[PDB]
């Protein structure tokens, strides 16, 4: 039967990879790989083995080797996970000056991060975390409400994203938005 | 200049891999890879690129692509880390029966684990850890002394090894020795 190596792959957008599709019939009728990716085949001996160079990996895809040993068949997919740190991570624009007392509502907007399963979005207050949830949707958002206090003057919040590719062998990639600086005031005023 | 992909590889003993050695001179004089590993070369187009299949990876090795662009040159090594869970993990044999009072000394002997940098050896008492150090030497050992107590009767210790390949994308591989069961006695006796 058909087999492929590797079976799981973590790679950058655009990145390419080598995939080997091997079988166990000594003289199989057909052997190839089923994918839309720009592929390329190489001079590998003992043709019970074929090596393809997949190319413009822009998306999580699952290439599939297929070896046709008569009626029926058998296959084997490989999991290509494409990774990339969000194109933009910022809080919706807001006026720094805010009235003491309102249940102000912060909203972080994230655009295009992948794999979204390892992407966490986190609203903070300085380096103190407020809300912390996974990135979902596009642009993915996250909200929290701050009851503005006199104490908050000078306080400044930010939104940060965490792309944890550590368990996949890579790193934890983070991105921080520009800081929202809160200026408060009590009334009698302005 | 010369470049290689991947640059770091974690693989099983025996395991093989595909390495690509690419250069940037459009018409370079020489391009190949410097290694003792059984290698094999494939039909890859645009020969500014060569793909080798390294084979009997029994050891941490660092294969090196070299592209000769006139006098001088340039190269690029790839890091092959070969992994394998210890062949044997056991405590030196000891008589279960021990006198209340002695500073009994336990000794766990580990043979052949790799990469030793991620291999931790840990002496335990039931599932309660006693000593916990990295595996060094061959057979690598680890010792601790238990002052035998009347309370210890029925207590049983073991030695366990932890091969943490999680940060490298793999898993944490563990191995537990057979359990040393302590039987104590106070004297007047036997
Ligand atoms: C989010 O953070 C990532 C990682 O810290 C940034 O991406 C890196 O940017 C540097 C400088 O351009 C490059 O040398 C790296 O190759 C990039 N790595 C990746 C995975 O992209 C990224 O620029 C940040 N996002 C934004 C919008 O600035
Ligand atoms: C130490 O633990 C490892 C992992 O739990 C054992 O190795 C696995 O053994 C099973 C059964 O033979 C195989 O299916 C796996 O392919 C093995 N994995 C690896 C990485 O070897 C190993 O047997 C244990 N060591 C000893 C001496 O028993
Ligand atoms: C990382 O991403 C994978 C694949 O998207 C997901 O299943 C896994 O749970 C995530 N792990 C962490 C630690 O984020
Ligand atoms: C804003 O409102 C929520 C809901 O009442 C509350 O839990 C939160 O504490 C308020 N924020 C602050 C900073 O007081
Ligand atoms: C952001 O807000 C925190 C918390 O008030 C503050 O300590 C930090 O210095 C602020 N950052 C900037 C750039 O003002
Ligand atoms: C894993 O092994 C590497 C390479 O041997 C070592 O440098 C690294 O510190 C180890 N990490 C852990 C978490 O054991
Ligand atoms: C055996 O000796 C060491 C050194 O005195 C001591 O620290 C240890 O507590 C003793 N073991 C036990 C179980 O009492
Ligand atoms: C090993 O010793 C522990 C601690 O005394 C005990 O709880 C455990 O059951 C023992 N294991 C066996 C197999 O006897």
UniProtKB/Swiss-Prot annotation, chains A, B:
It is found in: Membrane. One of its GO terms (molecular function) is virus receptor activity. The keyword Membrane applies. Residues 14-76, 101-166 form the Ig-like C2-type domain. Glycans are attached at residues 103, 118, 156, 175. A motif (Cell attachment site) lies at residues 125-127. Induction: Up-regulated by coagulation factor Xa (F10) in atrial tissues. Up-regulated in atrial tissues by rapid pacing resembling atrial fibrillation. Keywords: Cell adhesion, Disulfide bond, Glycoprotein, Host cell receptor for virus entry, Host-virus interaction, Immunoglobulin domain, Membrane, Phosphoprotein, Receptor, Repeat, Signal, Transmembrane, Transmembrane helix, Ubl conjugation. One of its GO terms (cellular component) is extracellular exosome. Monoubiquitinated, which is promoted by MARCH9 and leads to endocytosis. One of its GO terms (biological process) is cellular response to glucose stimulus. The keyword Iron does not apply. Disulfide bonds join 21-65, 25-69, 108-159. Homodimer. Interacts with MUC1 and promotes cell aggregation in epithelial cells. Interacts with ARHGEF26/SGEF. Interacts (on T cell side) with CD81, CD247 and CD9 at immunological synapses between antigen-presenting cells and T cells. ICAM proteins are ligands for the leukocyte adhesion protein LFA-1 (integrin alpha-L/beta-2). During leukocyte trans-endothelial migration, ICAM1 engagement promotes the assembly of endothelial apical cups through ARHGEF26/SGEF and RHOG activation. Belongs to the immunoglobulin superfamily. ICAM family. This is Intercellular adhesion molecule 1. It comes from Homo sapiens (Human). The chain holds residues 28 to 217 of 532 of the full protein.
């Amino acid at each position: 039967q058909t087999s492929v190596s590797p079976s799981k792959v973590i790679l950058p957008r655009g990145g390419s990879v080598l995939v080997t599709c091997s079988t166990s019939c000594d003289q199989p009728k057909l052997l190839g790989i089923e994918t839309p990716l720009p592929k390329k085949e190489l001079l590998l001996p003992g043709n019970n083995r074929k090596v393809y160079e997949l190319s413009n990996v822009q998306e999580d895809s699952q290439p599939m080797c297929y070896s046709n040993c008569p009626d029926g068949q058998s296959t084997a997919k490989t999991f290509l996970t494409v990774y990339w740190t969000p194109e933009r991570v910022e809080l919706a624009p807001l006026p720094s000056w805010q009235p003491v007392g309102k249940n102000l509502t912060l909203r972080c907007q994230v655009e295009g991060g992948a794999p979204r399963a390892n992407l966490t979005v986190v609203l903070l207050r300085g380096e103190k975390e407020l809300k912390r949830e996974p990135a979902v949707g596009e642009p993915a958002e996250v909200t929290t409400t701050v009851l503005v206090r006199r104490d908050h003057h000078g306080a400044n919040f930010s939104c940060r994203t965490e792309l944890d590719l550590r368990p996949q062998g890579l790193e934890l990639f983070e991105n921080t938005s520009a800081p929202y600086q809160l200026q408060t005031f009590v009334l009698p005023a302005t």
